[PDB]
Amino acid sequence: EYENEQAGRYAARAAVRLCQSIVDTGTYPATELQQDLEDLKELKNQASLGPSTEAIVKEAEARGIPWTQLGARFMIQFGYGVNQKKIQATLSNQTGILGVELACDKEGTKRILKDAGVPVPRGTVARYFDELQDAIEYVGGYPIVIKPLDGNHGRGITIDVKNWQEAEEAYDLARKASKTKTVIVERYYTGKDHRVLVVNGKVVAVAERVPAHVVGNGKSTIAELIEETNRDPQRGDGHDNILTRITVDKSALDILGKQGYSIDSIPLKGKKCFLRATANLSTGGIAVDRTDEIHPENVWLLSRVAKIIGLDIAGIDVVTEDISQPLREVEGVIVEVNAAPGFRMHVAPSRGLARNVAGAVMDMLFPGSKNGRIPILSVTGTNGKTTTTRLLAHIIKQTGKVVGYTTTDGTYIGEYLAETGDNTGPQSAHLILSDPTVEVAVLETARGGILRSGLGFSSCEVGIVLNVTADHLGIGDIDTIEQLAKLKSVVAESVMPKGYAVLNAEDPLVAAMADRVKGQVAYFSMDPNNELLLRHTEAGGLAAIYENGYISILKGDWTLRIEKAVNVPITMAGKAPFMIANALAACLAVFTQGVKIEHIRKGLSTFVA
Amino acid sequence: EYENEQAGRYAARAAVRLCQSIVDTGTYPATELQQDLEDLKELKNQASLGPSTEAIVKEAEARGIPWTQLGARFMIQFGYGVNQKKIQATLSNQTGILGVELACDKEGTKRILK
Amino acid sequence: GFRMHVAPSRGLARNVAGAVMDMLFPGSKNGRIPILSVTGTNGKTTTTRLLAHIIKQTGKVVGYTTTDGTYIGEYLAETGDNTGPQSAHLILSDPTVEVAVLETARGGILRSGL
Amino acid sequence: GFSSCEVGIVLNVTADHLGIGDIDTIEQLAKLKSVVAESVMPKGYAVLNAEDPLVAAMADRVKGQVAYFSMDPNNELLLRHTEAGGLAAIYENGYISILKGDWTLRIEKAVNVP
């Protein structure tokens, strides 16, 4: 058993080498063992997804929704056929280009939000020095924030200035950093900052950010809290854990020096003393859950903002004195909107209740108690797989559905050929199930695919087993007909509880698969006097027989005749008895899915080989 | 009547100046007239959309569907309230981020199509 | 771009804009919502508020603008607003408004029109 | 009066009044009250009180899912049921909370309920 393909193969290759080295020398060097272990760890880390992706994948697996990994851009596809959805990290196939592009433009989104009445921080553009004073009149005085018009990742932007000389030097620095000599000055808003997550137009979680700080509640200074904090298991490196190690950098040391306290200075009255002012969880900030104590008007406003920008999943930054009051009484503003936010901060608040963000996302993708599954019919057997598969496809084509079917001849999507030189393994199944237009999948499953790579799907709605004959043996580890029966039993065993297993009652080996099969069992037989079939029909039903020149279906105590068995072109007026079994199997499989009798008749009369 | 707001205001401001210059001197210099005409042409060209946008806007107007110009990124909004749609040049609000990003990656789209 | 298809220079032109507009609005439908414009000398505000309250009884989101302020359904959107085209644009651009009720004063008609 | 019910709620069983009919023992009363819990369809739910041992003993011989409600948030049976499964309700810190497995959903402050 393995969890990662490359890691599993490497471990398998290394085990035999280790055993050979032991039997050759009596012991294995420790350095080689450590090399192998670190190589395994590197392999495991390499084939790993971003934490949001594992969260969503685990949530999907908890609901029984199939998921596959596309090879293009680390995209994950949920579902099959026309019911599939795609996610990358948090962006879905429904997320718009226009909304994402607008969110990346700060001035554009600010102007859009201002036109809709949403409170936004006041600001003004200026290009000449003498105009700055006038701008100070518009913003309302001090303090102010200086930023350049064209800049990414905060190039040359100050945080807080409260007098004339610092404002002048910050403006000069920004102008020397600005590419167009023009600078926006905006009113600095003080207050607690919150990060609100909006999914499908509804607020899911609200988190309050507190800047990285220390508290002297234990009557101790930083010299001991540095080791005290290291004992918490949450601390670590990377970008997967919310609690990162406290990096005492030169900038942070200068900030705490100008903060107004010293290394040995005890906090006054027992107040938190901050180490940085960025208020970031990656830096080492603290999240607080405030989902419950939010005013309904604020929720309505945030939902309106998310709908106005045009983002299904959005992260809004708010600055307010209190989140339990409307943003009008307090001087609250909307700072920025992010199109692809991470929710690692909301899953582990570290103070409060955790919120199920992955559940909300999965509910948005699949609204009701529905999964992205499509009808699947897997046909296996020794002799007549191809004809049965083609007959099933032709019969289902009579209904207005697009049918994708794979067989020995080639892979077909509806009416037009998709692949000529294809195999009947998992590759063709993946090709069929990934098409955005296929509604019903019909797959011929040969034993070679099962032995080499196994089945390409977790479960099937209909599993047909025609017959098992030991006409060819000696391949692989299959040397006995019992082994072949066990190999063919995989299709029957991998049937969901609401599915059907269509088995041949005449063959004792195939009929022995009645047990260890979840879901209903339907028998088809060329002999209408089979004891097992009659016993099954008397208590239950759903069998198919060939009684008096007729293809009949027994639904218990009732008999439904389909065709005269001589009007079917493939039977050649009944001269070929082998094709009648395939016709019986196909008709029974189609009937188990609810297709009307007249459709089956029309499909059977028209189909040609 | 005007077709462009800035062009119309400029023409209105220029007409009275031209008439005052005529009644003051008896004629208007040709260089100033050419300057005003080229300024009007520049104003008309400045407040113009990409040809796809005029095509779609004309088609929408032929069907009596209201259209407005948003001030963010040259986006055009059709309709009112819950029945509105947005287009930039040919991208709609229904166009996905994933599809656009995949189309820009040649190797990724080739591997997907294969 | 579809400028190449509109003017093939050899063959028949194709209506790409028509196809795009059909994709945006499938049937013979437009992006219009119910609009009620109230004008008068004396009782515009009371009539507008009464209309909004009556329509609110039906399960619809109503956006209405009057002298007091611009309201989107139940929650106040703008306190210090005018009854001109600006409030109308604010009402009609909201992605949740289904019925618009607007008080139209003569000042807005004289200054900027409807 | 019905063959099956979608939701069957059993609050508590106390032997405050006995001697009627053939019900003279609290076990007989528990068996009589167990009819509602037992007559629940496989897709239904049985809402039982985890604090009462007699009511909690009805966990077996019941078709369909079982949901426990308790006034004590430290009940061992409720926590064990939530760890493997979920759908319980508790009163933890002045809150009416619902446990859906590893998640807690708070409803009311328990003092705003009249």
Residue numbers in the entry:
A (entry chain C): 115 to 723
B (entry chain D): 115 to 228
C (entry chain D): 456 to 569
D (entry chain B): 570 to 683
What did the study's authors say about this model?
The biosynthesis of cyanophycin is achieved by a single enzyme named cyanophycin synthetase (CphA1) that catalyzes peptide elongation coupled with ATP hydrolysis.
Mlid is not well resolved in the apo- and ATPγS-bound states, suggesting the mobile nature of Mlid.
